[PDB]
Amino acid sequence: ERRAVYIGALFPMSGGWPGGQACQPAVEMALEDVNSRRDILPDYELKLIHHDSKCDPGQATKYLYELLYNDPIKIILMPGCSSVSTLVAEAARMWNLIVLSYGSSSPALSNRQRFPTFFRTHPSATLHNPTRVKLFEKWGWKKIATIQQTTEVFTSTLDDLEERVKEAGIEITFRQSFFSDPAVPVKNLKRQDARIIVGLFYETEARKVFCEVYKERLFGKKYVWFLIGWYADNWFKIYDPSINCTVDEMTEAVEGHITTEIVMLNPANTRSISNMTSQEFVEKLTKRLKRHPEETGGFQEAPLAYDAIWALALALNKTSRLEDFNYNNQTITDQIYRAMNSSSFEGVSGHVVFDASGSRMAWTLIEQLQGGSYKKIGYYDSTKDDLSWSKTDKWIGGSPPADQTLVIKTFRFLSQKLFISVSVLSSLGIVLAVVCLSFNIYNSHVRYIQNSQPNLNNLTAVGCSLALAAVFPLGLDGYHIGRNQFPFVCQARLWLLGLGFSLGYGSMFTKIWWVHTVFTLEPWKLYATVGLLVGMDVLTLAIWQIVDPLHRTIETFAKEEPKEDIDVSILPQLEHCSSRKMNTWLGIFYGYKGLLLLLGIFLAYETKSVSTEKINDHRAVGMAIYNVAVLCLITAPVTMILSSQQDAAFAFASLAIVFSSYITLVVLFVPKMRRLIT
Amino acid sequence: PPLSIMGLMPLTKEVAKGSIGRGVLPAVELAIEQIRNESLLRPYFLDLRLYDTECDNAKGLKAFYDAIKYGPNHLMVFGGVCPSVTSIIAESLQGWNLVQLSFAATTPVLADKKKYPYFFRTVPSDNAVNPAILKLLKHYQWKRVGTLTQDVQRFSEVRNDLTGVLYGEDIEISDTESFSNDPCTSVKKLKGNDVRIILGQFDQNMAAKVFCCAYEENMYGSKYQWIIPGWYEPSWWEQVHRCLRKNLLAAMEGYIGVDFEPLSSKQIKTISGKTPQQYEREYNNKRSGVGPSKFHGYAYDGIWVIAKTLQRAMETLIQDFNYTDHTLGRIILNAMNETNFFGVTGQVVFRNGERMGTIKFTQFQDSREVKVGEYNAVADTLEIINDTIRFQGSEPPKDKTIILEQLRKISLPLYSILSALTILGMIMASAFLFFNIKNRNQKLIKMSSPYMNNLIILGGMLSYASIFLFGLDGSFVSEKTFETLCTVRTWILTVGYTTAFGAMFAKTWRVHAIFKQKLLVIVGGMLLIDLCILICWQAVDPLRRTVEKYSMEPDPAGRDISIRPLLEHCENTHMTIWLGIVYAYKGLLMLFGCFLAWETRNVSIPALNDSKYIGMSVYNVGIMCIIGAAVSFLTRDQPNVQFCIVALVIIFCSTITLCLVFVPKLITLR
Ligand SMILES: CC(C)(C)c1cc(C(C)(C)C)c2c(c1)[C@@](O)(C(F)(F)F)C(=O)O2
Ligand SMILES: *[C@@H]1O[C@H](CO)[C@@H](O)[C@H](O)[C@H]1NC(C)=O
Ligand SMILES: *[C@@H]1O[C@H](CO)[C@@H](O)[C@H](O)[C@H]1NC(C)=O
Ligand SMILES: *[C@@H]1O[C@H](CO)[C@@H](O)[C@H](O)[C@H]1NC(C)=O
Numbered sequence A: 001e002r003r004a005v006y007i008g009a010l011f012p013m014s015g016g017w018p019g020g021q022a023c024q025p026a027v028e029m030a031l032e033d034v035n036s037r038r039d040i041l042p043d044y045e046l047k048l049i050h051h052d053s054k055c056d057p058g059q060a061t062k063y064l065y066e067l068l069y070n071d072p073i074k075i076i077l078m079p080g081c082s083s084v085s086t087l088v089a090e091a092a093r094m095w096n097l098i099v100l101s102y103g104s105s106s107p108a109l110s111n112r113q114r115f116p117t118f119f120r121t122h123p124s125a126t127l128h129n130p131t132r133v134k135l136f137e138k139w140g141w142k143k144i145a146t147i148q149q150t151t152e153v154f155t156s157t158l159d160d161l162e163e164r165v166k167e168a169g170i171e172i173t174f175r176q177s178f179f180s181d182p183a184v185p186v187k188n189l190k191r192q193d194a195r196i197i198v199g200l201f202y203e204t205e206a207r208k209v210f211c212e213v214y215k216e217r218l219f220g221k222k223y224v225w226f227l228i229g230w231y232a233d234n235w236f237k238i239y240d241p242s243i244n245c246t247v248d249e250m251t252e253a254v255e256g257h258i259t260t261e262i263v264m265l266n267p268a269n270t271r272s273i274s275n276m277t278s279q280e281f282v283e284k285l286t287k288r289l290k291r292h293p294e295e296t297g298g299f300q301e302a303p304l305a306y307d308a309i310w311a312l313a314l315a316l317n318k319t320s321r322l323e324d325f326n327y328n329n330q331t332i333t334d335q336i337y338r339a340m341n342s343s344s345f346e347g348v349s350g351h352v353v354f355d356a357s358g359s360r361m362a363w364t365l366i367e368q369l370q371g372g373s374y375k376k377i378g379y380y381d382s383t384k385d386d387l388s389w390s391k392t393d394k395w396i397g398g399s400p401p402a403d404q405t406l407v408i409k410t411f412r413f414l415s416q417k418l419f420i421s422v423s424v425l426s427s428l429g430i431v432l433a434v435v436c437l438s439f440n441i442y443n444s445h446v447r448y449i450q451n452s453q454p455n456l457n458n459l460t461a462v463g464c465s466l467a468l469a470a471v472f473p474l475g476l477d478g479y480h481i482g483r484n485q486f487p488f489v490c491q492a493r494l495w496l497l498g499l500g501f502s503l504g505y506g507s508m509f510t511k512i513w514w515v516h517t518v519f520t521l522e523p524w525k526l527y528a529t530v531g532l533l534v535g536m537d538v539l540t541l542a543i544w545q546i547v548d549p550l551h552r553t554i555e556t557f558a559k560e561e562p563k564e565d566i567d568v569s570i571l572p573q574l575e576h577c578s579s580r581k582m583n584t585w586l587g588i589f590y591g592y593k594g595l596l597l598l599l600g601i602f603l604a605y606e607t608k609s610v611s612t613e614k615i616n617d618h619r620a621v622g623m624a625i626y627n628v629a630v631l632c633l634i635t636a637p638v639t640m641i642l643s644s645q646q647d648a649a650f651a652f653a654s655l656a657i658v659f660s661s662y663i664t665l666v667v668l669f670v671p672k673m674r675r676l677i678t
Numbered sequence B: 001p002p003l004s005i006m007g008l009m010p011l012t013k014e015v016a017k018g019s020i021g022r023g024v025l026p027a028v029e030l031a032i033e034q035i036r037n038e039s040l041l042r043p044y045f046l047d048l049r050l051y052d053t054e055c056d057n058a059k060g061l062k063a064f065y066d067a068i069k070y071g072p073n074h075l076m077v078f079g080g081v082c083p084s085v086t087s088i089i090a091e092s093l094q095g096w097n098l099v100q101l102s103f104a105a106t107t108p109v110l111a112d113k114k115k116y117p118y119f120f121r122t123v124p125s126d127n128a129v130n131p132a133i134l135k136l137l138k139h140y141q142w143k144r145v146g147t148l149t150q151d152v153q154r155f156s157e158v159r160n161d162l163t164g165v166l167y168g169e170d171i172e173i174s175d176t177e178s179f180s181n182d183p184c185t186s187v188k189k190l191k192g193n194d195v196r197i198i199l200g201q202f203d204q205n206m207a208a209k210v211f212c213c214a215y216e217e218n219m220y221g222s223k224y225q226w227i228i229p230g231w232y233e234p235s236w237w238e239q240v241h242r243c244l245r246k247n248l249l250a251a252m253e254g255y256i257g258v259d260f261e262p263l264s265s266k267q268i269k270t271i272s273g274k275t276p277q278q279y280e281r282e283y284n285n286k287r288s289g290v291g292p293s294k295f296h297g298y299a300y301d302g303i304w305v306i307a308k309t310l311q312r313a314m315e316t317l318i319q320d321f322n323y324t325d326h327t328l329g330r331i332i333l334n335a336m337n338e339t340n341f342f343g344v345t346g347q348v349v350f351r352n353g354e355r356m357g358t359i360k361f362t363q364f365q366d367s368r369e370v371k372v373g374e375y376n377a378v379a380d381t382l383e384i385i386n387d388t389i390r391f392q393g394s395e396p397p398k399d400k401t402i403i404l405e406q407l408r409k410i411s412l413p414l415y416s417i418l419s420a421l422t423i424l425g426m427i428m429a430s431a432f433l434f435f436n437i438k439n440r441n442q443k444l445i446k447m448s449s450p451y452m453n454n455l456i457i458l459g460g461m462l463s464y465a466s467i468f469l470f471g472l473d474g475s476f477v478s479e480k481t482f483e484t485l486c487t488v489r490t491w492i493l494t495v496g497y498t499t500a501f502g503a504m505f506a507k508t509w510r511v512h513a514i515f516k517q518k519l520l521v522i523v524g525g526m527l528l529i530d531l532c533i534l535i536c537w538q539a540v541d542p543l544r545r546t547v548e549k550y551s552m553e554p555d556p557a558g559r560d561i562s563i564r565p566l567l568e569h570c571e572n573t574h575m576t577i578w579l580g581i582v583y584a585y586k587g588l589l590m591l592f593g594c595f596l597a598w599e600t601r602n603v604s605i606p607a608l609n610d611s612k613y614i615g616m617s618v619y620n621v622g623i624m625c626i627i628g629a630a631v632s633f634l635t636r637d638q639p640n641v642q643f644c645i646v647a648l649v650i651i652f653c654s655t656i657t658l659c660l661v662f663v664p665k666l667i668t669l670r
């Protein structure tokens, strides 16, 4: 009766994760509740032999030697920290021992070929990765960086995260790792311009990582960190002599960083196999502790250490001889293994079962450091794919920082003050044209107005009015119109200006031509020549516009920094109409019109002295065509040179139309209206 | 008694790496039998007890525990060939005060002495090649390098040590790159940043993929250099079995591997009295047919180190060692720290537990790796052996593709044609001056003032001259003679215009005052205010020469030189004010001359009015000078068009104002 069956244990009281500060009172209690019950093990008694591994495998090797080579034979081993658990689980197959880790999360321990006799109540760390990928997909992040300490737990967690992000279309664009000094990888992260960083390292290493982060200025509006939620709630305020940054300086470096953890405690008020709810368990464990749970390490993982003892006892119960066990016999080991494998029971941490992948807790908690205190921002279940968001995440500027400063394509527009001014000038120009037209057609033959050819001057003013009202299409940029309505503004430029120039220059070119060739007379030929000129011009323009329609085209410029804000670097791109082939059709058109203008100037100079009275004012017509010719021959190539500058081209076209259209109307009509009706 | 040592080696033949252990036993026995013949340890004798560790972390720890419990009082640990068990054993030495000395562990993680304070290593580690790479870079002036690291512990630690080795030197890291399974999702970034020297830290089977992707980006040839680790198996490139092998060999040809040197080439006598070549012959005739391991000399030197350390530790002096004596472990550690002697692998000396040894370089030729130099770490010297190292180019690959500044030149044929046209303008102006001066007595010329005409011909003659000073860029003019010529041209242009038009406005003043020597005084008074304006200009801002550089992007014609176009021009703090003042004064003079000319044309002077000519010339000048001012100041970033416009408008204006004044009189005289 009461034959003592001993178990070995390694509780880390310090180091990278001081889980033993609360996981030891968890088993010290669990051994009393399991020994007080008679239905569990009446013939045996579970006793504990424990040491302090301190997360250091060097101490764990010496203590495993002292455990495996002393007289009292141990039936099972219980390591904590991940490195100690890996060492023990890989060494134990030489002694035919079962290993049962209560606080090991390394995903590398899931394969049964390398650790064939290992079990754990702690869930695998691959549960953090679906939550991270969900938070990356929710906020549209596609490029993340990683920095982790080169421990197998973090390496395997990062490999699983890499596989998960590769599945979801996310890319890990930068990767850093360090053994004991993170200055170099943090400086490389700052040089490489990493925005969304994922840190996988212990708290004692996290303090140094973030001290170098503060000295490197790798925090603020542009960067966001994803840490692990297993740290103490004040790890950045703890005095540490190995790191320089003052706690008030370090509180700024850790700000707004997101952390994920697992619940590990059943929130339902149902009673477990031990006949106690989760709240009574927490209250009893807090009574067994020397200090508040907020300052005791490993308080979150104590239910796992509680359930590991019960799983061990329930597995030894179904196997009922245990004193004949020795490190040279594997039958008792196989029996206890097949009894542990098939274990399923309702413990304090929920439904305890030892599956192969190590995934039995579904809920993951997400929280954020807001003002020096953690706040829970939501939960996530990956087995059902449901995210319960609380909507309490605070960001600087009210939005999550986006990585990879993109390109914003903005258009350059015409300064609307100038366009409005020139439009007002053109409106006054067409009202002046209609006033002079009403004048010259009201006095059709009442007086000597008929001595000057009246219809030629009338339709000259008509062409002038069209060419002057053709400035509105030439000024309509993408600011007022949009793309769908745009291709008709291009033809409203071309037809109006071409027909206006043809009708307002051929009509006072044919008059000069007829003065020359009959005065150095016929009433209808003066209209036949201008009709032929305008018809042939319209033919030569329609062949171009129909054979090669004019369509929009964007010319893209080099990137510039619009740092009038703190936002994206834009690139400006101009939009304007062009043909599939350009500067050949427009060049030939300009050359032909320039030849007509030169011939007009020549004929107006050759006939400046004739004193005919069949035509009244050919000299003012000659001056008008000289001015029109000089303005158009100056401002035709200028708008071809300044095409990539919208305001200069528009001013040099619109003012070279406005001035010419004012000068021709004045020179023709104010002498006649002045001498006729003074 | 005997002084016992615990040797931990893979001895069995079931493991593939046991070929190392069975290779070094022929060597260690050569050291053991020697020590007992010369009797370095006089009262004691050394015995090394071997234990099989098949590199399983389970079997090796079992052997270590069984040697601790059932074995003699071991004073030291010796060996450890596989790093997985070697780190496990080395981290726990503090619990038994055992000092381990390895001869085949090369991972750099064992270099830090906060985690492994009792570990010693006779073979140069993986991160001991960085000081050699530094001296190789300083030998070829490669001051800018990129890196390609595989994200695992050993290679990331080598890279993190390299970052601290180059600190303080002039060498720069352009971009650090990392990968885990696909190596050339990162080689494209090394091609985009255009690094020419690449330091690689990756394993053997990743190197084939790295090189087969560097073949795609064409990151090979006469302008790229690879420096990867050389501890790879011989003929490692034949074992990769989708990528063609010929392209792999063409892409990898020329890489420089860096790895430790097995034996010393010096012929001086070692601590054992034999030279390295004699020891090599003794080793090659000691083992019959066992495969030769490259760690045999390091095991020989490790045994001699152990012997000398035990000698010094026993002369420093508790006689037994129950694994609890901390003082004896500390004495053995301090005696091991002071090891300094010449053995078959060079000078054995430790610096913080790590060996200071020689590192050789091997360049890849056709189908082999030949030795090209050696770096001695104790003397800190690099000796590249001659005639063996080569490059596919005539010179060693240079980093930092050259950038150079070149001026955006005003095309010489355009300047030539317009300078040949303006001299025709000047000779026709001089012919008109001859016409004016020969026929000065006829009434057709005496009706006009013949001196107010030879002032306007002077104005046009020197304003034609101003075209050249707009074309002098800097292809053939220096700093100061350009800076002063920039104001010589503005004096020339402004006084030419002011004389040329003030003279005809004075001629019109005279005819307007008569009809209702004094003509020169008012053009002198106009030049007075003009020179006052330009002296107030020069006293404030003398138009200092500036130069704008932009668009460092454009490619060359193909000689691989990034040409940076930049261009020089005259500016100041604010040219708008000065140009506006000058043009406003000149326009006021223009309008007040046209007014006075129109008053003369209102009354129809019979044969010398010429006010229609004043009107036409003033109109043409008023439009063309405004156009030339507004277009030259908006095409400043393309100077060829700027010059072709500012010269053409000057030609046109200064020819019209001459002809419309001079030709109507010559056409009626002849
Ligand atoms: C076109 C038109 C207005 C007929 C004209 C054109 C010229 C140019 C020499 C520039 C070709 C011209 C005149 C008139 C003058 O009668 C004057 F009035 F300008 F003197 C003159 O001889 O020059
Ligand atoms: C083992 O313990 C369970 C309660 O957990 C009990 O019901 C059972 O009776 C025990 N073993 C046997 C075979 O009685
Ligand atoms: C580290 O912090 C301490 C205390 O603020 C300061 O005295 C010291 O100068 C810092 N490090 C350096 C560069 O000395
Ligand atoms: C479990 O414990 C509670 C607490 O007193 C008790 O009321 C209940 O009867 C117990 N049930 C069993 C099955 O032990």
Ligand SMILES: *[C@@H]1O[C@H](CO)[C@@H](O)[C@H](O)[C@H]1NC(C)=O
Binding pocket: A324, A325, A326, A328, A329, A330, A331, A332
């Ligand atoms: C020890 O192991 C052997 C293996 O065959 C087994 O036959 C024997 O019953 C075992 N004895 C015990 C458990 O003491």
Ligand SMILES: *[C@@H]1O[C@H](CO)[C@@H](O)[C@H](O)[C@H]1NC(C)=O
Binding pocket: A341, A342
């Ligand atoms: C443990 O149970 C699982 C459940 O399917 C099974 O796959 C595995 O083979 C079992 N273990 C042994 C040793 O049979």
Ligand SMILES: *[C@@H]1O[C@H](CO)[C@@H](O)[C@H](O)[C@H]1NC(C)=O
Binding pocket: B322
């Ligand atoms: C170590 O030696 C002392 C002195 O003889 C002895 O009392 C002790 O039992 C020994 N311990 C071990 C582990 O050998």
Ligand SMILES: *[C@@H]1O[C@H](CO)[C@@H](O)[C@H](O)[C@H]1NC(C)=O
Binding pocket: B334, B337, B338, B350, B351, B352
């Ligand atoms: C060896 O180490 C000691 C400290 O234990 C140190 O004082 C001494 O300078 C070192 N000598 C060397 C590195 O040769």
Ligand SMILES: *[C@@H]1O[C@H](CO)[C@@H](O)[C@H](O)[C@H]1NC(C)=O
Binding pocket: B386
């Ligand atoms: C190489 O060594 C030879 C000695 O045989 C020497 O003459 C030659 O100058 C050396 N080459 C260089 C580049 O120093």
Ligand SMILES: NC[C@H](CC(=O)O)c1ccc(Cl)cc1
Binding pocket: A017, A080, A081, A082, A083, A103, A104, A105, A106, A122, A153, A200, A201, A202, A203, A228, A230, A231, A301
């Ligand atoms: N669940 C506790 C576990 C313990 C360990 O894996 O050593 C752990 C893992 C990772 C961190 Cl950062 C902190 C603690």
